[PDB]
Amino acid sequence: MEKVREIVREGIRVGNEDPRRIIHAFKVGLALVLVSSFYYYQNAMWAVMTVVVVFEFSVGATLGKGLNRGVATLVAGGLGIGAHQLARLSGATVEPILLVMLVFVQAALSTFVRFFPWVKTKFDYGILIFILTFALISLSGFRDEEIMDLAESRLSTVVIGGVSCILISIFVCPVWAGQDLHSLLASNFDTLSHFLQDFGDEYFEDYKVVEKRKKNLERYKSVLDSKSDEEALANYAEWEPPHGQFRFRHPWKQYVAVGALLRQCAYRIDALNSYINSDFQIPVDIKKKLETPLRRMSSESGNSMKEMSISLKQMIKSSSSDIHVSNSQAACKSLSTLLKSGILNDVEPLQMISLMTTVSMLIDIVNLTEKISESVHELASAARFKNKM
Amino acid sequence: MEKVREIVREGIRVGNEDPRRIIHAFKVGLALVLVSSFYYYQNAMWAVMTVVVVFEFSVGATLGKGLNRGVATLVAGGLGIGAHQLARLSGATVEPILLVMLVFVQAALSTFVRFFPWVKTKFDYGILIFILTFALISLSGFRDEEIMDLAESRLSTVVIGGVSCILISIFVCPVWAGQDLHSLLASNFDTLSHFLQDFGDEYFEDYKVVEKRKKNLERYKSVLDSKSDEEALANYAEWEPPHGQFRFRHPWKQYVAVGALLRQCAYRIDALNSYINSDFQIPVDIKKKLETPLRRMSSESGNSMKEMSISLKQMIKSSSSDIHVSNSQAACKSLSTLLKSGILNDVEPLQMISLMTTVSMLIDIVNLTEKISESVHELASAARFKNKM
Ligand SMILES: [Al+3]
């Protein structure tokens, strides 16, 4: 009655974090009901098995697992029938031995192929079904024709299950991986912008300091650890048919590269937070001499990252990043001028080490953000995003 | 004939990168042969299906998928038989309708449960088999007793397939995930040490420069991107039974934390490499004034990281890290003394920004390495590693 309350609030949390989870939870049920009725009213364990194992969250994942299962079952049925014909051809007591030896050799060779990188990222489930169907067809004890009917039945049922799941996955309330990847990048951008604004606010400054530590740390600490997510969403979205704004080739590799550049900014930001959170604290009246330039640079980088998030959600071509970032380079120029003013020769050198480290951090962040903005513009053009602006 | 040569050298590469892949490739074949013979000489499609889908690389993965399939099939057979009894109890034409409605509701609820985090990391395949077996038993058209025999047969065959795979995976040439996680951490440590030694060598300095760029970049660039690997190996090793040096509780969460601290060092190292690889080059005769201290700190950190890798491979308690790191803090003290000597007031400030950035980077790396060494010592004690030394 106590842990039950625990999982009840867990369930409400995981639910209201995303409602499409509940809608997909109903979609799987719909698929099972339709398949059952179609094979009751007009085997059938294969139809329900494949509708459970195929239907996944996105539409890309569903289409990908569906074509994996289909094509693999087709090719495996082919090679299996060929093998069984030759096996029955040779002899009557050697048939089982040469059959089992073929199963061994083929399973071994394929299991080894499951370790290549290019085949691991895309067709791993494909190879798995290859092995499975090969051993299904080759390792039965029926007659000549029974195997042909078994093969055609397995192929047809796999196709029907896969097609039912794909249709349901597209036409009810589709969850495209493309939109999730775009939105994930936009969320990452947004968290980095929140951190940069709060830093440009709080660097030069009991429950409130901890709440601020929450709002400072966990955003970028979740930015850094999103590599498997973006790589997964890319490998799912590449299967998706053209829908909405996306043309035939929407170069997902390039978006993943943009994610990488994001994490580079996030590395430097981690260094910045680690210097903030230190106890070796430089007196504020020393940092006073540099307030306005550093705050200008931080604020402008934050605004530009923000509008970039906007442009990755709305898919609208912008050019204000040129203005915001050129002004940031000008801020770096004025900062360079302030540096030549002999303004930091009157501070003990350990402060100099700390302050110059932080200043160099922010400089690197501004230059990086210039790089990313250029990438996103040419990404909007090659993808031919709306030039409405 | 050309691409064939291509995949042939790919195959030899992926092979001689690790031979246990080939041995496991033979283990799967052995499993298929034994299962086939045991169900031929004395259904059986389920035995071969479960031996293919269960048997994975490690021993942890095999045991985990095995217990997932087993326990899920047991519980699902139970609830399925209960449901079918009640369904046949109510009526004779409403039986199919209330059956299909139960299938719908249960499949939907479970598919939603597949989105919790704690259930995703461990029992996702478990929930999948839950749905699958529930729809197998509940959605057949047999009589009262046929379902009981179907349920017992499915349970027994799943158990036999799982047990055969587990035994083969343990007793032939086991691939423990524990040893792989320890060795992976040791390899990460080793690459960071190689970089630190080469940096302390080359910071103060046509085919050779590119080969050195190879040996500088790709090591740490593969350190950073190993988060899914270490999290995966932990989630596999937690299932493993106590073997070798590992006691009952070997706190894998703590080793994963040590991996995290590694990547923190790797972030700063990425910054260092990005400053090396720049074209905005400080004249060497300026960096001359700081050679011996920076080289001392780098070399000592490299030695300590190296011996830490040794201690994570051999599993032997060491204490030389205290000496190597205390000497590094003393090097930082002497560096502090050199800084108060007014030694850098005779350099244009942009050089000052660059040099102070690099010096602060190395300081952070030394402090971080002190933290990691403390963690690994108390990790050797709580795990009760051999105190031989
Ligand atoms: Al099956």
mmCIF file of C-alpha atoms and ligand atoms in Angstrom, chain A residues 46 49 69 132 154, chain B residues 46 49 69 132 154, ligand 1:
data_model
loop_
_atom_site.group_PDB
_atom_site.id
_atom_site.type_symbol
_atom_site.label_atom_id
_atom_site.label_comp_id
_atom_site.label_asym_id
_atom_site.label_seq_id
_atom_site.Cartn_x
_atom_site.Cartn_y
_atom_site.Cartn_z
ATOM 1 C CA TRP A 46 3.041 -15.987 -35.707
ATOM 2 C CA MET A 49 4.106 -12.712 -32.217
ATOM 3 C CA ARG A 69 11.648 -9.283 -40.604
ATOM 4 C CA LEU A 132 16.011 -18.106 -37.016
ATOM 5 C CA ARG A 154 5.596 -18.052 -42.576
ATOM 6 C CA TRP B 46 10.455 -23.097 -29.695
ATOM 7 C CA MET B 49 13.989 -20.156 -31.401
ATOM 8 C CA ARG B 69 12.179 -15.256 -20.833
ATOM 9 C CA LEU B 132 3.739 -12.256 -26.264
ATOM 10 C CA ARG B 154 5.841 -23.577 -23.657
HETATM 11 AL AL AL C 1 8.641 -16.781 -31.988
#
